[PDB]
Amino acid sequence: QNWRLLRDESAQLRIADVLQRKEQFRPLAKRSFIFPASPQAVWLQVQLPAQKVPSWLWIFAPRVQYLDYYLVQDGQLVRDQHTGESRPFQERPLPSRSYLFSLPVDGKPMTLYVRMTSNHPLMAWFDQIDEAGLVGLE
């Protein structure tokens, strides 16, 4: 698959450092994970073909303190957004307090990198959704 993960036990790898280790990402048997409380960073990588309709990456990450989001196209970082529960504000309209990232329609594929860290268990679910899913989030 293209929904891949990477465990950073040092927690020091950055976006450049992670893009220098693309061959260490490994396929996920499912679209979620959970890890007991540790100071490890969990990096998710998603390669998508060219998109034809407006869509969003949804991530329900309860108890997740820091979450950094990076988007890669033509070897460039087009978007770089840092948020998280430990991050303040970031208010958005989902009762769930879930996360959504718009996925562009620009005639090129894309690679997503997401870093998650916490002092609690690293529960997380994620998927790509269209408008049929967007209108039903809570």
Ligand SMILES: [NH3+]C[C@H](O)c1ccc(O)c(O)c1
């Ligand atoms: N849709 C995102 C939502 O506003 C939000 C904001 C900050 C958070 O720490 C979070 O989990 C969710």
